[PDB]
Symmetry: C3
Subunit: 314 residues, 3 copies
Amino acid sequence: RTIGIIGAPFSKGQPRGGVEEGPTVLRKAGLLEKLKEQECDVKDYGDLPFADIPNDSPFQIVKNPRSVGKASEQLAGKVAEVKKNGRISLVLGGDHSLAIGSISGHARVHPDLGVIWVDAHTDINTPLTTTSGNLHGQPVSFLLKELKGKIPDVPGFSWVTPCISAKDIVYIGLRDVDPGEHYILKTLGIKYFSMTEVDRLGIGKVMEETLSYLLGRKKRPIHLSFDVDGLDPSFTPATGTPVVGGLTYREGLYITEEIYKTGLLSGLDIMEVNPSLGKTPEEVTRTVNTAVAITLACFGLAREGNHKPIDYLN
Amino acid sequence: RTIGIIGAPFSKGQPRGGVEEGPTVLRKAGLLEKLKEQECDVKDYGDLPFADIPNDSPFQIVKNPRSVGKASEQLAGKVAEVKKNGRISLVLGGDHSLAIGSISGHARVHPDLGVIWVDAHTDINTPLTTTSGNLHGQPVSFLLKELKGKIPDVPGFSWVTPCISAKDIVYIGLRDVDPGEHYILKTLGIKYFSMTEVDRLGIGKVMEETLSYLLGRKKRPIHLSFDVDGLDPSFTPATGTPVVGGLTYREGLYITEEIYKTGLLSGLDIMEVNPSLGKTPEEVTRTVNTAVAITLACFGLAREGNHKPIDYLN
Amino acid sequence: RTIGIIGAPFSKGQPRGGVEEGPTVLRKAGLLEKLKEQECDVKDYGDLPFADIPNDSPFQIVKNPRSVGKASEQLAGKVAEVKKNGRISLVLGGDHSLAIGSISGHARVHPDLGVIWVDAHTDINTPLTTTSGNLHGQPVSFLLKELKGKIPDVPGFSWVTPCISAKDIVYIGLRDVDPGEHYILKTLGIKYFSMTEVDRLGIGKVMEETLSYLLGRKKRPIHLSFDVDGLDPSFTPATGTPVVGGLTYREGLYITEEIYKTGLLSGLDIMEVNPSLGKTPEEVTRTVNTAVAITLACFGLAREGNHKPIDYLN
């Protein structure tokens, strides 16, 4: 599979700053190399140079709006470019607010994309339902068409135009959803598989149904926004908003292995990896190594094994 | 759901004493508050004042019979009272021998109840099959009608009258059952799902079958006797009789989430939490926090989320 | 079930030496006793006295060929003897290269055996496809009939004669397979359940299908070659080639519990336990205790419980 790597060192979507080191630690772990070690065509577009917006006071409760809004705007253009070059966008991110730019830029070139959101949270709070004001918990609200006329003109987001409909997304791993968010899920009829559904059905059926839900009508590009906190913090401890009872390492790999096999992956986000939050050096490497493993499965690494189209017995 | 909290600081059903701190640590963790934070009507009936029975020598092999027998007798009356007030009894316990009083008091008001026992053990040894003599491993033997005329007149239990039939109970999580106990399971035909069945079927099917088994005929009040050692000790380490290979945090929450949804929960027991046995302070908080989470799911907290009957988008 | 214990203190199939202590630590953990505590007829044939072959230089890339080849030859004779005495061979091993001798000796007496290989690896590299040269990653290549004329005359293995066909074996737990190995799996059509299939189907269905695959045609003796690294290193850390995302303790016990119930277990291998590799004393006891538990389930220990054909209520 041919990838286009985009480093997105941004954190203003939430409090803790260490998340901007994500692209750094991931590359350092040998991500580019390992992808190449696989049948992958990799082009590194570098880390986006996000500038400091000194004058960025809160919009009502919303924090760092201009900073977050600009970073996604910049990211949107980069993703559209990589997509225009026939490459799967791989956004090594900071906080999940960048999904606004990633999914948006992706949709410019492929307006018919389906989104799969693996997270412990729905991140669908509106600037008016959020309680923390952190924009990494509001990305989905800006992207939904049905929520248009429900989001205030937030400084820094005028360039945004809702690109996905409530029926074009599936959540997997949910276990910490606010009341307002829950009301939105049920009101717009968004399809989700919280940890309760994973326990009931098994990750296998969850993926069967998820892929059926988005590809039944017809094949369409797939955007996978993966938040490392979707997995249990026993696997990805170095993250800002960990919630117990998460997806396992295996379930994480199963999900991505199944997405890969569709041959329809078009955009990928690996978010919220924050080294600065590992209680120990090992917790950092455990988080980074797991993040890398999920990324590799997205592009073909199979646990059963891989082999070239040659005769190994000769 | 409307609850009636009963603190049961008792431990004489087994060796280690720290179990009597259970009601204390659970309340301190904010149980009442958190339940209230939910759509719950909560009435705290306090911690039962168990008096010391200085003269309580062994009955054959059975230890602290009068002490254990009196505590359950006292608990039985409290549960019957809370049930008479139209409230779900929530027994924050010490050792599982208190189930004798909890299930018994519950059955006085609702003779048609079905019991769900989540434990690593069956606790169905008779005063004559037990090898340790600890009464927390014999509660079920006193409650079964079919075992009547098989239990010796144990000092302190003359007030007991078997209230449930072998067909009115289901075990979930079994992984440490004595030979005598196993013989009783098979002879009386008790329905159970040991860890082997959970692995084979998945917790989803286990709950489907469990609820079908007890509610198929007709709807009936449900008594859930939850022992924290039913879950793996990686989740609930601060307990006296931990057995490896237990139910997971998720499975624990799945079970209770499903029970809640029946709308038939009538009595709940949260037992065997012993702070004094945590190798570290964190093992104590891990055990207590998990115990609280299971309790909250019993009364509505859903991992997918919760929202009031209002318009959050306004 | 009647067992014939064989200690196989060998390690030259790989780099780390501590694996030869396996039979020692396992016996010390009380394996013989515990089996006896069960309805088991146990005869200890002792630990095979493996002599040092000072002159054993590499055959091409293959390391310690004569040493490894002799140990399996010696083991083959012992297994055939125990099988001739109507006893289930229980090989407490060192490295997995000994499977060559175990499966081979077993097949002399029972040419129609079916093999179940629980491992994180396939160990089916040929002396010409292996990259490390360690023979514990090549055992299966020597045993397959279809690979005959594909394996070089390796010094020390002239006594070998391929005994099993590609269709007579099933892999469970795979998660680290080389390209050459993968090509062999697909070319010979070997049946396997990598970690991806376990996640998709559940261990229950995996065992249903595995047993159906090997016993559908007709009943045949079963040889279970269990490598402790098939389970996740959170359960069996003291092993030389651990791979994350492995089978759980429960899945481990489920597998063996199901094999036992077939009443067809004929040969068992408990391999790769290396005490010298536990980061701590507890990691050693965790590894050994888990190895023992898997062994006990192989011969009847059930999590639901066990009882004799007597009246426990009398």
